[PDB]
Design a protein around this ligand. Structure first.
Ligand SMILES: *[C@@H]1O[C@H](CO)[C@@H](O[C@@H]2O[C@H](CO)[C@@H](O)[C@H](O)[C@H]2NC(C)=O)[C@H](O)[C@H]1NC(C)=O
Ligand SMILES: *[C@@H]1O[C@H](CO)[C@@H](O[C@@H]2O[C@H](CO)[C@@H](O)[C@H](O)[C@H]2NC(C)=O)[C@H](O)[C@H]1NC(C)=O
Ligand SMILES: *[C@@H]1O[C@H](CO)[C@@H](O)[C@H](O)[C@H]1NC(C)=O
Ligand SMILES: *[C@@H]1O[C@H](CO)[C@@H](O)[C@H](O)[C@H]1NC(C)=O
Ligand SMILES: *[C@@H]1O[C@H](CO)[C@@H](O)[C@H](O)[C@H]1NC(C)=O
Ligand SMILES: *[C@@H]1O[C@H](CO)[C@@H](O)[C@H](O)[C@H]1NC(C)=O
Ligand SMILES: *[C@@H]1O[C@H](CO)[C@@H](O)[C@H](O)[C@H]1NC(C)=O
Ligand SMILES: *[C@@H]1O[C@H](CO)[C@@H](O)[C@H](O)[C@H]1NC(C)=O
Lengths: 190, 190
């Protein structure tokens, strides 16, 4: 039967990879790989083995080797996970000056991060975390409400994203938005 | 200049891999890879690129692509880390029966684990850890002394090894020795 190596792959957008599709019939009728990716085949001996160079990996895809040993068949997919740190991570624009007392509502907007399963979005207050949830949707958002206090003057919040590719062998990639600086005031005023 | 992909590889003993050695001179004089590993070369187009299949990876090795662009040159090594869970993990044999009072000394002997940098050896008492150090030497050992107590009767210790390949994308591989069961006695006796 058909087999492929590797079976799981973590790679950058655009990145390419080598995939080997091997079988166990000594003289199989057909052997190839089923994918839309720009592929390329190489001079590998003992043709019970074929090596393809997949190319413009822009998306999580699952290439599939297929070896046709008569009626029926058998296959084997490989999991290509494409990774990339969000194109933009910022809080919706807001006026720094805010009235003491309102249940102000912060909203972080994230655009295009992948794999979204390892992407966490986190609203903070300085380096103190407020809300912390996974990135979902596009642009993915996250909200929290701050009851503005006199104490908050000078306080400044930010939104940060965490792309944890550590368990996949890579790193934890983070991105921080520009800081929202809160200026408060009590009334009698302005 | 010369470049290689991947640059770091974690693989099983025996395991093989595909390495690509690419250069940037459009018409370079020489391009190949410097290694003792059984290698094999494939039909890859645009020969500014060569793909080798390294084979009997029994050891941490660092294969090196070299592209000769006139006098001088340039190269690029790839890091092959070969992994394998210890062949044997056991405590030196000891008589279960021990006198209340002695500073009994336990000794766990580990043979052949790799990469030793991620291999931790840990002496335990039931599932309660006693000593916990990295595996060094061959057979690598680890010792601790238990002052035998009347309370210890029925207590049983073991030695366990932890091969943490999680940060490298793999898993944490563990191995537990057979359990040393302590039987104590106070004297007047036997
Ligand atoms: C989010 O953070 C990532 C990682 O810290 C940034 O991406 C890196 O940017 C540097 C400088 O351009 C490059 O040398 C790296 O190759 C990039 N790595 C990746 C995975 O992209 C990224 O620029 C940040 N996002 C934004 C919008 O600035
Ligand atoms: C130490 O633990 C490892 C992992 O739990 C054992 O190795 C696995 O053994 C099973 C059964 O033979 C195989 O299916 C796996 O392919 C093995 N994995 C690896 C990485 O070897 C190993 O047997 C244990 N060591 C000893 C001496 O028993
Ligand atoms: C990382 O991403 C994978 C694949 O998207 C997901 O299943 C896994 O749970 C995530 N792990 C962490 C630690 O984020
Ligand atoms: C804003 O409102 C929520 C809901 O009442 C509350 O839990 C939160 O504490 C308020 N924020 C602050 C900073 O007081
Ligand atoms: C952001 O807000 C925190 C918390 O008030 C503050 O300590 C930090 O210095 C602020 N950052 C900037 C750039 O003002
Ligand atoms: C894993 O092994 C590497 C390479 O041997 C070592 O440098 C690294 O510190 C180890 N990490 C852990 C978490 O054991
Ligand atoms: C055996 O000796 C060491 C050194 O005195 C001591 O620290 C240890 O507590 C003793 N073991 C036990 C179980 O009492
Ligand atoms: C090993 O010793 C522990 C601690 O005394 C005990 O709880 C455990 O059951 C023992 N294991 C066996 C197999 O006897």
């Amino acid at each position: 039967q058909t087999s492929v190596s590797p079976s799981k792959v973590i790679l950058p957008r655009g990145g390419s990879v080598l995939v080997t599709c091997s079988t166990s019939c000594d003289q199989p009728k057909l052997l190839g790989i089923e994918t839309p990716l720009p592929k390329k085949e190489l001079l590998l001996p003992g043709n019970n083995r074929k090596v393809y160079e997949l190319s413009n990996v822009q998306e999580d895809s699952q290439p599939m080797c297929y070896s046709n040993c008569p009626d029926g068949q058998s296959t084997a997919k490989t999991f290509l996970t494409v990774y990339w740190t969000p194109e933009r991570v910022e809080l919706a624009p807001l006026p720094s000056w805010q009235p003491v007392g309102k249940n102000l509502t912060l909203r972080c907007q994230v655009e295009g991060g992948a794999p979204r399963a390892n992407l966490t979005v986190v609203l903070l207050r300085g380096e103190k975390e407020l809300k912390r949830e996974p990135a979902v949707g596009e642009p993915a958002e996250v909200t929290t409400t701050v009851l503005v206090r006199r104490d908050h003057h000078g306080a400044n919040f930010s939104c940060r994203t965490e792309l944890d590719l550590r368990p996949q062998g890579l790193e934890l990639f983070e991105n921080t938005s520009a800081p929202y600086q809160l200026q408060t005031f009590v009334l009698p005023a302005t």
